Amino acid sequence: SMHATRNDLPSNTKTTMIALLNENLAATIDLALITKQAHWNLKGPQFIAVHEMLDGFRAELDDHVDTIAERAVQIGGTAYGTTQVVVKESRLKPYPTDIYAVHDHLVALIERYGDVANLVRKSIKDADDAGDDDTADIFTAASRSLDKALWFLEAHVQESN
Amino acid sequence: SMHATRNDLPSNTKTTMIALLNENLAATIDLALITKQAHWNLKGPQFIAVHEMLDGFRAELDDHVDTIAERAVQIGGTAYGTTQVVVKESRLKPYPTDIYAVHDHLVALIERYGDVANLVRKSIKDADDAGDDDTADIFTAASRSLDKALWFLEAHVQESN
Amino acid sequence: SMHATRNDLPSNTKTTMIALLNENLAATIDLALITKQAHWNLKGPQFIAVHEMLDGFRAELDDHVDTIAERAVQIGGTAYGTTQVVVKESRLKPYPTDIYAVHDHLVALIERYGDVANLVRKSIKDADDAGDDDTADIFTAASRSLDKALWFLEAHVQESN
Amino acid sequence: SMHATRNDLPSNTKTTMIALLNENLAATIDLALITKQAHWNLKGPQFIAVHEMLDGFRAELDDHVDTIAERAVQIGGTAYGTTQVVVKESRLKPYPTDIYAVHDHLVALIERYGDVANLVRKSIKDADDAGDDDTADIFTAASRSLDKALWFLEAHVQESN
Amino acid sequence: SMHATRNDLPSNTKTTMIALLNENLAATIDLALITKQAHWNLKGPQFIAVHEMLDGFRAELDDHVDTIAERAVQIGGTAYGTTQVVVKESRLKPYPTDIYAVHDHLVALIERYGDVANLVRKSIKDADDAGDDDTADIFTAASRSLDKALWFLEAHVQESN
Amino acid sequence: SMHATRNDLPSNTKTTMIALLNENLAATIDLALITKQAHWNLKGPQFIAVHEMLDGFRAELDDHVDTIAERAVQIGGTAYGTTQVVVKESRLKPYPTDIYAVHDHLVALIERYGDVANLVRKSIKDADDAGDDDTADIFTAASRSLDKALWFLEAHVQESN
Amino acid sequence: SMHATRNDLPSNTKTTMIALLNENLAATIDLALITKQAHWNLKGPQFIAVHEMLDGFRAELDDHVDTIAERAVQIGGTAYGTTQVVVKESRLKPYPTDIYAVHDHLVALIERYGDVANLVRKSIKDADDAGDDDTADIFTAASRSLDKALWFLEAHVQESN
Amino acid sequence: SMHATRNDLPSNTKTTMIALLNENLAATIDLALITKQAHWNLKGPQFIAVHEMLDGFRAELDDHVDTIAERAVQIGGTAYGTTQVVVKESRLKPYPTDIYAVHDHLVALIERYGDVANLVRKSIKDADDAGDDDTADIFTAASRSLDKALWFLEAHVQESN
Amino acid sequence: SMHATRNDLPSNTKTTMIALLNENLAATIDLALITKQAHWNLKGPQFIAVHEMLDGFRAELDDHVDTIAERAVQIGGTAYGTTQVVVKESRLKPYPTDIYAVHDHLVALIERYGDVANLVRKSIKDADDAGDDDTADIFTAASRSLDKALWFLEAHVQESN
Amino acid sequence: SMHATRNDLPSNTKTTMIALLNENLAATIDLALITKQAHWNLKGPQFIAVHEMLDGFRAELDDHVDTIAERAVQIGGTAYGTTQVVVKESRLKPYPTDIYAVHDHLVALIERYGDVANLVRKSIKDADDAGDDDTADIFTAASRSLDKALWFLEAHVQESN
Amino acid sequence: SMHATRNDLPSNTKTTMIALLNENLAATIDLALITKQAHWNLKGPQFIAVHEMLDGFRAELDDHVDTIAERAVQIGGTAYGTTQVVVKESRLKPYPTDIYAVHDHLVALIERYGDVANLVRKSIKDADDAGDDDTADIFTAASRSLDKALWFLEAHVQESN
Amino acid sequence: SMHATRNDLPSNTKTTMIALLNENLAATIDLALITKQAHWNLKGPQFIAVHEMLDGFRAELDDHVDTIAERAVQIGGTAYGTTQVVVKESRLKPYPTDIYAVHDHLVALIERYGDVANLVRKSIKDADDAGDDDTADIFTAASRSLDKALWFLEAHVQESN
Ligand SMILES: [Ca+2]
Ligand SMILES: [Ca+2]
Ligand SMILES: [Ca+2]
Ligand SMILES: [Ca+2]
Ligand SMILES: [Ca+2]
Ligand SMILES: [Ca+2]
Ligand SMILES: [Ca+2]
Ligand SMILES: [Ca+2]
Ligand SMILES: [Ca+2]
Ligand SMILES: [Ca+2]
Ligand SMILES: [Ca+2]
Ligand SMILES: [Ca+2]
């Protein structure tokens, strides 16, 4: 599953970072699909603003998914992003397909956004500790996006009016 | 799974169309993931042109996925697009995660694109027959995109030089 | 009210389609005016999201108004779009000028959008049966926009939180 | 028909200005519809240039219509812009639906453009006199657009070659 | 002249549609050339507006030419668009190279745009009857453009002032 | 604090307008900061739509701040816009830093937007009476923006659903 | 030199405004040429910044020149803007063609910009006194541009470091 | 009037080319002002098409005016473009300020555009003969624009229908 | 075939340049159609890159075809660009409609691009010699585009790996 | 002043970072107001270049202010950016409102830019030390902008010619 | 070669970082020239795709070159990027000027991109270790670009079909 | 170093123009590096305007470098643009790396821009004499850019205030 590269990151670093990148890739792809799931099916008084907001989140996730995947490839590995892989390697709770109210989707999204945000933020440190600054930076950009999206979601529920 | 709408498409036709739209949604989301899987992992002399071409395909699939999903919702149904749904409801063979050569990706992609192209093309007629002209037209837009993408792939292998 | 054209749609077809286009033209012009009426006067907690949403609807309706009007003219007819014509030939229930609450506008708009959506959707079939495929396609484009707008409105009231 | 606002314009100025804004709103919406009525149906040697010019006028009118309506609302009033209100409140002579010649449309348009131009220009002074400088400015911007459009029309008939 | 494709349109449908697409391709390429011929050589008081209008037509034809040619290829065929093919397979009467006055070009264009508009419109139905919904849609888009163009030309001569 | 200019507005008019401009400059800079204060800290069901609306407000305020400051300079004065000046010359009540609910920020912002809208509106007349028509016009533009923003805010609370 | 218009500004207002507009038109066209004259021939340490600044000035003048000319024509007059008219009717002192130092051009330009700025500013009031609010407004927009340009010029010489 | 440059065009070529450039500068500035004069004052059936066309001409002339002037400066000279210089050094017949009919403007413009077109075209050869290829190219770009604009004008009068 | 123009190129230069331009016009229109023929039908491993490249070539060719044709008209001639003329006046070997391999299209295109590249290059000199500098420059621009396009084609076959 | 978040940064990291972010927020907002203060009031030979440069700085600061403020909120805190807070928590020496010469502004600005640049650069380390990689990155982006702006300023005074 | 700055990075950090930035600057400038050398001279079946790809690489390298150079200057140093310096300080093996095949250029480029990629990636850590977070971040962005480009290159040679 | 082409430029014209193109290529790449060297390191009162001006120069140079290099390759040759070639084949005096003052950079840049401007201008004539009109035109475009850039630089020193 590896290919040769002149990239001189140590071999053990490449192995551990490819694993870490793929773990994050599965999480973020799953979250991308969850985001559209919610976007299509939400109903209630805040429909249009939340509907539109979720498209923005998906667009951001798409960029980070690409950057994460391509990083695994750059350092000699394979990127694993098919449905069969994602369903197995993502730890996100299956997103309910029988919820509709904006509030139910917000609380469901907060759980999952929170899980992915916390994963990616930790992965910054794991990459830094492994000696892979570029990978750490990639997770840092992704984490900034995820922590902002998590805030946009939580801000809707942190007060009731 | 249903919500009331003033849309007066006959009730039985809504039911059959929601099912048809979800069948096609599962296929097109799966094909979207497959397209990126190939994009990241392709290697060989035609790397960059094919890499970029596949991003074009993904952007068009994303637009047809949204159109199909929202159509299901418009006529009073639920769009089902989570990883857990897609992995069960897509009939596309799992994309191999251990291929790299551009030619191997082209052959694997032609198989999946051909399957989705033919499914969506048949769905146009199923929708027209059922009396849902907007759904037929949504499938027609999708089919035109799929048949063009299929050609782009096949044109790479229909001659050898 | 007619002018000569090399367009060889049968004369009966032209006559029936010119009337059908004018019927839809009236309905859509009126819906455009209604849409702005609500946009200006809505008040309540969802003000800005709904206010901006209605501008998007108007922009889409304008494009369909033009397309329907110009089709009547293309096939040798006159397009009837003055206030005096619209107030008589639009079958939309007069929109109230004494409502303000966003909820009240949403409910009223759902009534009006449903009416036009269902008119245009059937008109696809009238045109197709008449053997005017271009006019049927014009109505199909307009119908897709109307069904999506109807959904955007209905989605606000289909759940309560 | 009123909602309270912190805008400290005196009650009498608010009520007089709301009425004046609504008078001009009805005239400009009607004129907007007239402009497209002519745009669709004009025929003759200068067709394309005039056809396009009238879309320019309509775009400008739309912006002024919005600005006038929204000013009535800002100062605590209701904007009245439905077909039923416009047909009663506009003083423009019903535009003929049985004229085609570019020249005939030019002459008929000049009549109505003249009427609205002169109405809006006078309304600048009425607002200024009422001590509502923002409304006067809104009318000044609309009047500049109207006087320029009137010129564009008249310039076509002021000489014969 | 054929190449293997996964596209599952029946063999006879492919053969007949490739022929129909090539017939329409020859007519539309010829019409494109005709359009520029007129564009360059027109003279008279309406010169600039008609000159520009005709570039708009050519841009539209170019897009329909490509879509039609590529459809023939997508379904396993060859697209035939060389000068030698077009001069043989177009049925448009050779365009006169010794006319100048805007009126004479408008009349000569009406003849040829009418012929192509009517061919394309009938071809929608031929494609639909053959069970090729994408091809039918391609001709529908092309027909819409052609009927609008025919009107823009005819609208210049349907009245004389 | 003054510099010579060939601008021949009367000396006493320059002095009184510089003062009036600076008074308005202090209020508008303070309002700009207040607007972002609200934007960052609001929480509740209408979060994203109101968050984004307030960025629109701030962008409009920035342009008017610049225009007011630069006018004071053009006519030979100094623009005073530092935090120390603003905290002393603004009469806006200090914005609470312990509120979060969207409703609470809307009412707080209505207070301050109203205060500024009414100041700027009065300042049009003060400038006109002083014989500085450009300064009056600058205040007119700022006032139209302020009255519209004030409406956007008040419209959220003028009805409860 | 006059043509008939439905514009109902009083006849004596038209006559006096047409003269005032043409007087301003002459000065502003002259200032436009002067601006470029300086732009081409300036030399010295601040060359590129001042060179580019002067192109910004010319672009704004051009817009006002057109608005002033077209206003004269809209109200039934002739716009006079040929070289022979401008050399006779411009109130500006002929610009020297034998200066080069940036400072020399700045000083010369300040004289000319001051004259035009002061003329246009006065003309706002002359128009307002004549009851022509649109013309007053056109001069206000022009005066705001000229006063700001005058400042940009003077600011370069109001301190020496 | 000269400043030193490292540009090693021979001194006599500089002197001759500076003179030639200034001759062409005066003609093109004069033609620019003439173009706007016609633009503002034309009246008749072709108003809007020709009005707009003349703005395109003026935009192009502006670019060539700049290029020509700057070339004189680049090779050590002064650019002479004030009203007082242009009225003396342009040999264009003063443009009439008492014509209105579009046909009258077309024919007057044709005479002036013909004069400048033919001057600039000859000047290409004069520059090439003097050994200044860059100046010859500047005149070639200007000449191409002028010959095309001359055609746009002439094409209007070369036929009558 | 000829119309009067003030363009003072000698009568014999005009005649010979019109013929020369039309010879090049036939070649370049033929090449434009050839480029699309290859674009549609090519197949093999380099498909997408070469497919897209050929669209770039076509766009450049279209611009030069227009410039060549319009130059013929500007100098009082007729542009001849119909299918019947091009098939007669182009000396390009008819393009084969039974080739597919990318390599075969590259070789076939190189023959035709070379022929046109070399005709246009020679035509620069023919125009210079005739004293038509603008026409020479028109051919210089076209020739630069053709020699670049020829290189892009040849570079594909000048090495084998 | 805290709200709950799923963001799993340690509670002490959140507290510490919210304080640090707010410290930098006060400094950067104060600097933003200082930058415009200079922008408006500067006078001297380098006026327009430095005037424009300072608007570039303010635009960059605005983005960093937003990012810093929002990060404090994301991690469960309150952002404090009112005039009253900034005047108390910014340590920048109050900016003089009685200086004009470009040089004096440059020297004053360097002091304040220096102080903010140095604070923000240190805060990268303080954030790293607290285990908040996203916050550190936010300060890194701000620090890069500040160090660059500081150079732009200092570069004006580091040599005298 | 140093200038005073308020930037308070420690003196030894400045000296060592200036040297490190200049070592990277020479490598990246050399690589930029190498990239264009390949781009112009490559020949073979993948010409156009690789030709374009290398322009993308060059545009990225230019941005990083500027960032690196400016950082050295910002911290009080001199940026050294002349040909004479680059040829002395780059360690990249001189690029062969006698290769043409795409494959030969790919292999040659991989060697040089690998060297620079590895140098920059190590330099991130050298900067972090010296306590210069902004410089580390600049190298991180550059390293990310380099590692991605290295992959784009290697991906072409990592498989043979 | 040569590759076969259908380009019919005479053999010795190809050889001599390849040499001449490579001579100018070395000069212009070296000037491009010089321009950036000045850009980064300049300091003094005119810093920002001159800093920015030099990026405009570099962008123009980059386009000419590409056009020159590609021309050499188009006509069958090799483009030589590596650091090792440029250092040997450029005759520009090594640019000083110990200068900072704006004036020092202007003087040094004037020397080198002058040398390159004069080389390229002569090269137009050498290409024309050899019969290569396209190469001559390429040098004409570059010469126009260089003569303009040289002026921009010399205008800063041609007068002292
Ligand atoms: Ca990618
Ligand atoms: Ca969607
Ligand atoms: Ca229309
Ligand atoms: Ca609105
Ligand atoms: Ca195509
Ligand atoms: Ca400003
Ligand atoms: Ca105008
Ligand atoms: Ca210029
Ligand atoms: Ca053309
Ligand atoms: Ca924000
Ligand atoms: Ca830079
Ligand atoms: Ca290139």
Report the CATH number at residue J53.
1.20.1260.10
Q: Which two tokens mark B101?
A: 């050569």
Tell me the shortest Cα–Cα distance from L147 to chain H, in angstroms: 7
CA distance F97 to G37: 56
The ligand minimizing its distance to the Cα of C69 is 3
L15 Cβ contact list (under 8 Å, min separation 6): none
Which candidate, E27, K143, L8, I123, places its Cα nearest to that of A9?
K143
**Cβ distance L13 to L132 under 8 Å?**
yes
Residue A81 structural domain: 1-161
Query: CB A5 to CB K151 under 8 A?
Result: yes
Burial class (CB in 10 A: 0-12, 13-18, 19+), K124: buried
CA distance K67 to G93: 50
CA distance D78 to D89: 15
Which positions in chain E touch D44 (Cβ < 8 Å)? Answer: 155-156, 158-161
Q: What is the DSSP letter of B43?
A: B
Which positions in chain K touch A72 (Cβ < 8 Å)? Answer: none
Query: CB D117 to CB G6 under 8 A?
Result: yes
Chain F contact for A156 (CB, 8 A cutoff) = yes
Which of D7, D131, D137 is opposite residue F117, by nearest beta carbon? Answer: D7
Q: In this structure, what are the phi and psi dihedrals at residue A101, rounded to the nearest 5 degrees?
A: -55, 140
Which candidate, G146, G147, G124, places its Cα nearest to that of G136?
G124
Length of chain C, in residues = 161
Which candidate, E80, E87, E72, E101, places its Cα nearest to that of E33?
E87
Q: Hey, of K70, K82, K93, which one would you mutate to test binding to chain L, going by the most L CBs within 10 A of its CB?
A: K82
CA of C52 from ligand 4 middle (Å) equals 8
Method for this entry = X-ray
Burial class (CB in 10 A: 0-12, 13-18, 19+), L73: buried
CA of D40 from ligand 3 middle (Å) equals 6
Length of chain H, in residues = 161
**Cβ distance A79 to B41 under 8 Å?**
yes
Map J109-132 to HEC letters.
Answer: HHHHHHHHHHHHHHHHHHHHHCCC
Chain K contact for A63 (CB, 8 A cutoff) = no
Chain B contact for A54 (CB, 8 A cutoff) = no
Which positions in chain I touch B157 (Cβ < 8 Å)? Answer: 45
* Binding-site annotation, residues of K for Ca(2+): 39, 55, 66, 70
Q: What is the dihedral of CA H2, H5, H7, H9, to 10 degrees?
A: 30
Residue I25 CB-half CA count within 13 A: 27
Q: Hey, of F55, F156, F157, which one would you mutate to test binding to chain C, going by the most C CBs within 10 A of its CB?
A: F156
Tell me the shortest Cα–Cα distance from E13 to chain B, in angstroms: 14
Query: CB C6 to CB E125 under 8 A?
Result: no
CA of K114 from ligand 11 middle (Å) equals 26
Residue with tokens 């498209």: A55
Chain K contact for L79 (CB, 8 A cutoff) = yes
Question: Is the CA virtual torsion I62, I67, I68, I72 positive or negative?
Answer: positive
* Alpha carbon separation from A73 to A26, B96, K4, K152 (Å, rounded): 15, 16, 45, 10
**Cβ distance K81 to L86 under 8 Å?**
no
Chain C contact for B126 (CB, 8 A cutoff) = no
Q: In this structure, what are the phi and psi dihedrals at residue E93, rounded to the nearest 5 degrees?
A: -60, 130
CA distance B45 to K45: 9
Gyration radius of chain G's alpha carbons: 17
Containing H/E element for E87? Answer: helix E83-89
Q: In this structure, what are the phi and psi dihedrals at residue B96, rounded to the nearest 5 degrees?
A: -65, 135
Which candidate, A74, A56, A62, places its Cα nearest to that of A29?
A62
Which of E3, E9, E70 is opposite residue B148, by nearest beta carbon? Answer: E70
Which of A118, A125, A151 is opposite residue J74, by nearest beta carbon? Answer: A151
Chain L contact for K133 (CB, 8 A cutoff) = no
Please give all residues whose CB falls under 5 A of ion ligand 2, grouped by chain where several chains appear. B 66
Chain J contact for A140 (CB, 8 A cutoff) = yes
Give how many domains chain J has, as a whole number: 1
CA distance G141 to G147: 10
What amino acid is encoded at H94 in this protein? P
Angle formed by the axes of helices I102-130 and I47-74, nearest 10°: 20
Chain H contact for G88 (CB, 8 A cutoff) = no
Q: What residues form DSSP beta bridges with B101? A: B43
Which positions in chain J touch A124 (Cβ < 8 Å)? Answer: 133-134
CA distance G145 to D124: 23
Please report, for chain G, how many H helices and E strands are present, in that order. Answer: 5, 0
- Chain H residue closest in CA terms to E52: H49
Residue J136 CB-half CA count within 13 A: 23
Query: CB B36 to CB A66 under 8 A?
Result: yes
H47 Cβ contact list (under 8 Å, min separation 6): D152, D155, D156, H102
CA of A70 from ligand 1 middle (Å) equals 7
* Binding-site annotation, residues of C for Ca(2+): 39, 55, 66, 70
CA distance F67 to F72: 9
Q: Hey, of A41, A62, A83, which one would you mutate to test binding to chain B, going by the most B CBs within 10 A of its CB?
A: A83
**Cβ distance K94 to K34 under 8 Å?**
no
CA of J55 from ligand 6 middle (Å) equals 7
Please give all residues whose CB falls under 5 A of ion ligand 1, grouped by chain where several chains appear. A 66
CA of K36 from ligand 12 middle (Å) equals 8
Which of B3, B9, B133 is opposite residue C140, by nearest beta carbon? Answer: B133
What amino acid is encoded at E61 in this protein? L
The ligand minimizing its distance to the Cα of B155 is 5
**Cβ distance I53 to I149 under 8 Å?**
no
**Cβ distance C97 to F156 under 8 Å?**
no
* Binding-site annotation, residues of B for Ca(2+): 39, 55, 66, 70
Tell me the shortest Cα–Cα distance from D47 to chain H, in angstroms: 10
**Cβ distance H74 to D132 under 8 Å?**
no
Residue with tokens 């596949």: B54
Give all chains having 3 or more CB-to-CB distances under 8 Å with chain B.
A, C, E, I, K
The ligand minimizing its distance to the Cα of C63 is 3
Which candidate, D153, E47, G68, places its Cα nearest to that of H110?
E47
CA distance K4 to D20: 66
Query: CB H90 to CB G69 under 8 A?
Result: no
Tell me the shortest Cα–Cα distance from B137 to chain C, in angstroms: 8
Query: CB E160 to CB D42 under 8 A?
Result: no
Query: CB C125 to CB B134 under 8 A?
Result: no
- Tell me: is residue H111 an annotated ligand-binding position: no
Query: CB G121 to CB F137 under 8 A?
Result: no
Query: CB F147 to CB D4 under 8 A?
Result: no
Chain B contact for K50 (CB, 8 A cutoff) = yes
Give all chains having 3 or more CB-to-CB distances under 8 Å with chain H.
D, E, G, I, L
Which of B50, B53, B159 is opposite residue I43, by nearest beta carbon? Answer: B159
The ligand minimizing its distance to the Cα of C38 is 4
CA distance D69 to D134: 13
Chain D contact for G66 (CB, 8 A cutoff) = no
